[PDB]
Amino acid sequence: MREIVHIQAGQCGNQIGAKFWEVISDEHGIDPTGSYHGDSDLQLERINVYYNEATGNKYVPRAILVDLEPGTMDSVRSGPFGQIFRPDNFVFGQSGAGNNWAKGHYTEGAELVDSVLDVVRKESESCDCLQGFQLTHSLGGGTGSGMGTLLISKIREEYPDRIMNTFSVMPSPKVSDTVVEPYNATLSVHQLVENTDETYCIDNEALYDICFRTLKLTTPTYGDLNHLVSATMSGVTTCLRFPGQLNADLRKLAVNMVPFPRLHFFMPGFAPLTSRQQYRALTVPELTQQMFDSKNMMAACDPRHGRYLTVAAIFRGRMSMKEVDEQMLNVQNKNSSYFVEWIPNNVKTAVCDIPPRGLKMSATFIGNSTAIQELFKRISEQFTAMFRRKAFLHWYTGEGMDEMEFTEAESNMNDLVSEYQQYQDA
Amino acid sequence: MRECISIHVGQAGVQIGNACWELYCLEHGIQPDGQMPSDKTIGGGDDSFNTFFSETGAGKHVPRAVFVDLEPTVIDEVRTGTYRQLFHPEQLITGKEDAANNYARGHYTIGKEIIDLVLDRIRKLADQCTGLQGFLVFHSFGGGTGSGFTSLLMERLSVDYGKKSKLEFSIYPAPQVSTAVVEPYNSILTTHTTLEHSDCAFMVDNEAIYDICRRNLDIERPTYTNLNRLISQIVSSITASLRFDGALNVDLTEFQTNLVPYPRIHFPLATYAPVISAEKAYHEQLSVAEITNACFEPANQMVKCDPRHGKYMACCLLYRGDVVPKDVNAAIATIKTKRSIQFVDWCPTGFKVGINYQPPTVVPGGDLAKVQRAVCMLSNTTAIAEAWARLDHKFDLMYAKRAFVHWYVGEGMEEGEFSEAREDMAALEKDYEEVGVDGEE
Amino acid sequence: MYTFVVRDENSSVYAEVSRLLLATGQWKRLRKDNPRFNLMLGERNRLPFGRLGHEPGLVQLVNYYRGADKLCRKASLVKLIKTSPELSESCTWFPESYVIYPTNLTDEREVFLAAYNRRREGREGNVWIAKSSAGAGILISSEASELLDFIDEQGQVHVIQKYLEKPLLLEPGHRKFDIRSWVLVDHLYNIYLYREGVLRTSSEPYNSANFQDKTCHLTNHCIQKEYSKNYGRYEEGNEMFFEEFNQYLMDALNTTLENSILLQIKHIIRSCLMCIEPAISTKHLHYQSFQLFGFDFMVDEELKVWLIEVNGAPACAQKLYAELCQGIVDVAISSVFPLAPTSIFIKLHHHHHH
Amino acid sequence: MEVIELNKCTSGQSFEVILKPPSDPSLEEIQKKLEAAEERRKYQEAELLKHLAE
Numbered sequence A: 001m002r003e004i005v006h007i008q009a010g011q012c013g014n015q016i017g018a019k020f021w022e023v024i025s026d027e028h029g030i031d032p033t034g035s036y037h038g039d040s041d042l043q044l045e046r047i048n049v050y051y052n053e054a055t056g057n058k059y060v061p062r063a064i065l066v067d068l069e070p071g072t073m074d075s076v077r078s079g080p081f082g083q084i085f086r087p088d089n090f091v092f093g094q095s096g097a098g099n100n101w102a103k104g105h106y107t108e109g110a111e112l113v114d115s116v117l118d119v120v121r122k123e124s125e126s127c128d129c130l131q132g133f134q135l136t137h138s139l140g141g142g143t144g145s146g147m148g149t150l151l152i153s154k155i156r157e158e159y160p161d162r163i164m165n166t167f168s169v170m171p172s173p174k175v176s177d178t179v180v181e182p183y184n185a186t187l188s189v190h191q192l193v194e195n196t197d198e199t200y201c202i203d204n205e206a207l208y209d210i211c212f213r214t215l216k217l218t219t220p221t222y223g224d225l226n227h228l229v230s231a232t233m234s235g236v237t238t239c240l241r242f243p244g245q246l247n248a249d250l251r252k253l254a255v256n257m258v259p260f261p262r263l264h265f266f267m268p269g270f271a272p273l274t275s276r277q278q279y280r281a282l283t284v285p286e287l288t289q290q291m292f293d294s295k296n297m298m299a300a301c302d303p304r305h306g307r308y309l310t311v312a313a314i315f316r317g318r319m320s321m322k323e324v325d326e327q328m329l330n331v332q333n334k335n336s337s338y339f340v341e342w343i344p345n346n347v348k349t350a351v352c353d354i355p356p357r358g359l360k361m362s363a364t365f366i367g368n369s370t371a372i373q374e375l376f377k378r379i380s381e382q383f384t385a386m387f388r389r390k391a392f393l394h395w396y397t398g399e400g401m402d403e404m405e406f407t408e409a410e411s412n413m414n415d416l417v418s419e420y421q422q423y424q425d426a
Numbered sequence B: 001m002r003e004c005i006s007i008h009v010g011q012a013g014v015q016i017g018n019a020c021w022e023l024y025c026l027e028h029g030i031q032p033d034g035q036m037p038s039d040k041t042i043g044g045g046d047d048s049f050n051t052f053f054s055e056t057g058a059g060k061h062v063p064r065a066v067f068v069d070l071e072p073t074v075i076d077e078v079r080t081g082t083y084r085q086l087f088h089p090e091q092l093i094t095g096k097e098d099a100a101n102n103y104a105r106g107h108y109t110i111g112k113e114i115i116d117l118v119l120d121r122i123r124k125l126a127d128q129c130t131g132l133q134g135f136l137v138f139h140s141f142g143g144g145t146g147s148g149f150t151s152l153l154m155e156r157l158s159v160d161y162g163k164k165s166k167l168e169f170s171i172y173p174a175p176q177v178s179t180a181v182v183e184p185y186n187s188i189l190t191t192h193t194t195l196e197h198s199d200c201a202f203m204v205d206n207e208a209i210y211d212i213c214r215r216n217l218d219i220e221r222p223t224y225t226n227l228n229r230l231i232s233q234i235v236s237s238i239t240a241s242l243r244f245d246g247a248l249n250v251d252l253t254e255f256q257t258n259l260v261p262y263p264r265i266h267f268p269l270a271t272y273a274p275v276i277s278a279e280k281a282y283h284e285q286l287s288v289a290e291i292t293n294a295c296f297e298p299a300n301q302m303v304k305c306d307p308r309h310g311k312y313m314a315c316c317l318l319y320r321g322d323v324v325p326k327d328v329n330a331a332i333a334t335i336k337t338k339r340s341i342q343f344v345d346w347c348p349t350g351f352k353v354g355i356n357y358q359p360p361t362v363v364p365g366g367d368l369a370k371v372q373r374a375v376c377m378l379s380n381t382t383a384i385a386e387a388w389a390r391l392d393h394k395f396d397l398m399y400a401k402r403a404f405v406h407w408y409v410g411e412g413m414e415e416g417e418f419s420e421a422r423e424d425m426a427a428l429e430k431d432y433e434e435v436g437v438d439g440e441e
Numbered sequence C: 001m002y003t004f005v006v007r008d009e010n011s012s013v014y015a016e017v018s019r020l021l022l023a024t025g026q027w028k029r030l031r032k033d034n035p036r037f038n039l040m041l042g043e044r045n046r047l048p049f050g051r052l053g054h055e056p057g058l059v060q061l062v063n064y065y066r067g068a069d070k071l072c073r074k075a076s077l078v079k080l081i082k083t084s085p086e087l088s089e090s091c092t093w094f095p096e097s098y099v100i101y102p103t104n105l106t107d108e109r110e111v112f113l114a115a116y117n118r119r120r121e122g123r124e125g126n127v128w129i130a131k132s133s134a135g136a137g138i139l140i141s142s143e144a145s146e147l148l149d150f151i152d153e154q155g156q157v158h159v160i161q162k163y164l165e166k167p168l169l170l171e172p173g174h175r176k177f178d179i180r181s182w183v184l185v186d187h188l189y190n191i192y193l194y195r196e197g198v199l200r201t202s203s204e205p206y207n208s209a210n211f212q213d214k215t216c217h218l219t220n221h222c223i224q225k226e227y228s229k230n231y232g233r234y235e236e237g238n239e240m241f242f243e244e245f246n247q248y249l250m251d252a253l254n255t256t257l258e259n260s261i262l263l264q265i266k267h268i269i270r271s272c273l274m275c276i277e278p279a280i281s282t283k284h285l286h287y288q289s290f291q292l293f294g295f296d297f298m299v300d301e302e303l304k305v306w307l308i309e310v311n312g313a314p315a316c317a318q319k320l321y322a323e324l325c326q327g328i329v330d331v332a333i334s335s336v337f338p339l340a341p342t343s344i345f346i347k348l349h350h351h352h353h354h
Numbered sequence D: 001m002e003v004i005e006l007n008k009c010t011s012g013q014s015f016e017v018i019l020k021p022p023s024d025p026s027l028e029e030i031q032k033k034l035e036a037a038e039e040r041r042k043y044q045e046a047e048l049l050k051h052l053a054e
């Protein structure tokens, strides 16, 4: 049993995390009360990766829910699968973090973090063989961003030999709550550069544009964005949750995907993306082409603007593996220039027989592309436009931060951008 | 009679091991419960099959084998499988978390903690042997355990069993079925540290087996199960001489004597024919001349390469089934007049031939058809160096950028071990070239 | 979209082939170190054949046959002919030749002298020629001593060959020549003789009393354009093509190029390539080969054709680049990688029963 | 084409045909290597914990 411990923090983190557990619970045949009602042994074979077994053959998510205000976790608890979570794994304060990284990381978050670590330890202690951790959060707010990265640092201190994986929602001016999001995101990215092994970068503008342009949703909601993210998270974790050879655990995945320690930020993608023709059969060739289509990717970065260091592709459903191999080989052989030539055979493909609910087949894309630098450049530009005038800084210096820490975060992310550029030219 | 101990390391080693022991039981008339009706000496004996099987007082025939893996799920198959009664718990060794496709993790970090347990279990087997010959070691190049723990184990076996022969069966990495981008690193690191500890190694390229299964068994997308059943057939041909009455390759020492005049150059090429589909409704049976001629086709080799552009140091033909010497010599004469077969000047141009009258055994309900006669050719040809060139090129591509190197250094390995290993391979390639080889116009 | 890589920038023939491939709009050129190619236009030396044919989902083709060097090296060709039963030491279209290693290094010195001495005693013509692949470097002499000593002053393998004292001389000019034939062997080992050949002529009158001045003895295009005053006097660039040569043969000797010479050329080409087919064929191999060869012939005054050598990386005559290069694409490349006449080649084949 | 050393038994036979004639680290050292690597992991981990302490 290679247990993963899941953590979800702040508003974004808990809303997406709740949807994620809804989605994979349905895949494993777990109902809202933790009872199993599936019809396939494939569903239970690796169920212990994400679920603990309670008395009465109940399955309980190995999940810790964290926030600095009670509202979103109240909603989670009142939601569809809200009763499936362990009540003691709800850890929350009352004062909130005010969309402020400093409040999350240094003041409000600091008061709460030990109680979170106590629950993390309790979950880790019962693991037969802990793989590591996966955190869901946004980078643009205060709790997920500031307290989330505080958590990651303390977890690394207590579990230095375990893998740390995040699903990190990057802010965009187009789908924005506050003007200080670029401050919060820049502060957090430096934390992630040092303390995660794998980070899936989800850009809210990409999510919005997929909903509006491709799915024809006239007025996308956070709820719509979150179902996209949930479907993607289900796809990217398929290899962890079902029998398989490739990327079957967090460490083997990292060894395959991360050739240089700092360059561990992935662009995920999902297919099919279909507007409400929705009954039309999908072919492997069509899955493959859409999976690699920039329009199906979620970092708002143009892959043709860079090069792939490594790629993992996961196909789900009953389909010809012969055709999958053929189609995957075709994509690499016909656009070979976008794959760095100094990492031979850097595209790995996995197939899982169980498709997502309500689909005959689907495909999920994980790319380690140097084009991700565009995302960090955007954040850096927005950061500097304000910081050059020290605008909105008083929210942070009021929590004890000084300007030098912002200067260092800025330099750190520009270093990261430079590091991507050198391998794009290599 | 002198005993041989088989050691199966990591997923590839273990699963190939389970395929081989299954086939051995079928060949020797041993049931899944270990009983062997044809063995009239209950509870002991020194027959040729006793080289691979010991005997309990209850008449159980138990493989002289240890299975080792750093994660438990593959060996849990063996504990749980058809031949579970064959083995006792002390023969199966598992850790809790694997080497993550990382040679350094397998060799240094985890290997350090499990190596003494493994040697203890091996010692227990050796204490049952009146005259231990040495070891047959099965593993992948590409896995962290298959690469890293095997090289550690091989070093310690040279220390604890200095006079004993060690043969390898090694799975060379193929991207069509591979699970890690770093397998070229692992392959070259393990080859470097194992080189001086191995007397003879049979490399099997997954690419070759994969393509034989697709082409000759009509399997669209071969599984490890398909691959391993074919690999076990070749392994069985190679070890049959140790397990049956005969006068060729009857002990491990003879493998080196017959196939390896140059110690570092200890990688014979295996070629096997015929491979026929069991679903093939109508099959014309192949003659001694036809299966022998097939031994000189790259399409039938365990490693794709071109022996026409290399030189032979030694050649062994191992037949199973309806074959007499007269027909072998007639086939060889013809083949020499048609094929490119150059031996090095300091070796004789000839063939050592073994015939076992019992035709190949096939797993009931398997992919392979029963045939009247089959042959495995073992030739030490410099052409196999093509596989080292391929591997070394991929290694160079990644190492020039230090891609993935931090994973290894992070486990305590020094970066210098990379260049040291690669320098050793460069010399190996040069050795093959010295043995093998002599615009605007 | 098919893909290819270029690894010999110095090749005119394949610069043009590359040019054509791109012009189809259906071929893409990759960086020379990208492994995901359909087609490799390889380097002349140490081409990595061992890395070919291991790319899942890519049929791979290269423009050289591994092992063809046996035919395309001076010393290797001599050895191949003497030791191959299909060719033999009594082969009639190859001049009496010997491999000689400089004494600062088997070696046929004594066998050469014995044959040399026999001629000297029987009043026979005894002019031999020393040459080697390591040249741009040639010595013609009727004295064995000069021949053997000239080779010792060098450090590479050499060939001493009987010099054809009775060449066919073109008129006017009384001049020597050699015939170049271009031959394309595809992946199926079809042997294709390009219909157009070229006569590389000497613009100096042949002189058997002076082998010291080599311009009238060596027909090489480079040598003629450098050391011969009358370059281009009789024909443009000292190149006469088959139409004119045929018209000459009719006019002067009442015969045809096909009858007097080409029959022998085709015989020799097929004999050479069929001899090494088992050694180099890629029929059941994991990658495939084709190669363009340049055969060089001499004709004596009895209209007997002699093979001089085979070139593994030939250039073409300027006027013929476009046609032959298109021919390469059509039969050697598009045959394997079809795109979305009256062939220019003669397929050499013959199945006599006995 | 000479056959030599023909051996026959009930289970088969073997022979040789000639077409033409011719013309370690000690336990101590392994230990030191494994302990040296372990030491380097410890140093790297110690450095990380120092960084996190700061």
Ligand SMILES: C=C/C=C\[C@H](C)[C@H](OC(N)=O)[C@@H](C)[C@H](O)[C@@H](C)C/C(C)=C\[C@H](C)[C@@H](O)[C@@H](C)/C=C\[C@@H](O)C[C@@H]1OC(=O)[C@H](C)[C@@H](O)[C@H]1C
Pocket (backbone or CB within 6 Å): A023, A211, A215, A223, A224, A225, A227, A228, A230, A231, A272, A273, A274, A275, A276, A278, A279, A356, A357, A358, A359
């Ligand atoms: C807006 C499109 C909704 C449905 C489409 C017709 C498609 O459905 C089918 N059956 O083909 C789906 C796959 C779309 O392509 C997806 C982009 C929809 C998507 C994930 C998110 C939208 C943004 C969001 O509004 C959401 C509330 C709408 C529909 C989801 O209930 C669809 C299901 O969600 C899943 O998690 C599984 C993959 C699978 O069961 C899927 C059928």
Ligand SMILES: Nc1nc2c(ncn2[C@@H]2O[C@H](COP(=O)(O)OP(=O)(O)OP(=O)(O)O)[C@@H](O)[C@H]2O)c(=O)[nH]1
Pocket (backbone or CB within 6 Å): B009, B010, B011, B012, B013, B015, B016, B069, B070, B098, B099, B100, B101, B102, B106, B139, B140, B141, B142, B143, B144, B145, B146, B147, B171, B172, B173, B174, B177, B178, B179, B183, B206, B224, B225, B227, B228, B231
């Ligand atoms: N032929 C064959 N190859 C296998 C098998 N299992 C794995 N491989 C190959 O072995 C390589 C991966 O090594 P594994 O043996 O799975 O790794 P391991 O030795 O268990 O090491 P870790 O899992 O890294 O601790 C890849 O090249 C696989 O294609 C098998 O059953 N048969």
Ligand SMILES: Nc1ncnc2c1ncn2[C@@H]1O[C@H](COP(=O)(O)OP(=O)(O)CP(=O)(O)O)[C@@H](O)[C@H]1O
Pocket (backbone or CB within 6 Å): B441, C095, C129, C131, C135, C136, C161, C162, C163, C164, C165, C177, C178, C217, C218, C219, C220, C296, C298, C308, C309, C311
């Ligand atoms: N045995 C021989 N008898 C008469 N002339 C000869 C000869 N060998 C060579 N020659 C002359 O010398 C020239 C060059 O000889 P050779 O072909 O062996 O060397 P090379 O490779 O440098 C020139 P090329 O290959 O382009 O023909 C020939 O064109 C021919 O005219």
Ligand SMILES: Nc1nc2c(ncn2[C@@H]2O[C@H](COP(=O)(O)OP(=O)(O)O)[C@@H](O)[C@H]2O)c(=O)[nH]1
Pocket (backbone or CB within 6 Å): A009, A010, A011, A012, A013, A015, A016, A097, A098, A099, A100, A138, A139, A140, A141, A142, A143, A144, A145, A169, A170, A171, A172, A175, A176, A177, A181, A204, A207, A222, A223, A225, A226, A229
């Ligand atoms: N995709 C998605 N993004 C969200 C959601 N809620 C907030 N965000 C984004 O998250 C950032 C705000 O952080 P939030 O999680 O609300 O702050 P926190 O509660 O302090 O962590 C902004 O970039 C918002 O666009 C959500 O439910 N889904």
Ligand SMILES: [Ca+2]
Pocket (backbone or CB within 6 Å): A095, A108, A111
């Ligand atoms: Ca407080």
Ligand SMILES: [Ca+2]
Pocket (backbone or CB within 6 Å): B039, B040, B041, B042, B043, B044, B045, B046, B055
């Ligand atoms: Ca017995």
Ligand SMILES: [Ca+2]
Pocket (backbone or CB within 6 Å): B158, B162, B196, B197, B198
């Ligand atoms: Ca030894």
Ligand SMILES: [Mg+2]
Pocket (backbone or CB within 6 Å): A011, A012, A141, A177
């Ligand atoms: Mg909010």
Ligand SMILES: [Mg+2]
Pocket (backbone or CB within 6 Å): B010, B011, B071, B098, B143, B145
């Ligand atoms: Mg394993």
Ligand SMILES: [Mg+2]
Pocket (backbone or CB within 6 Å): B441, C309, C311
């Ligand atoms: Mg030449």
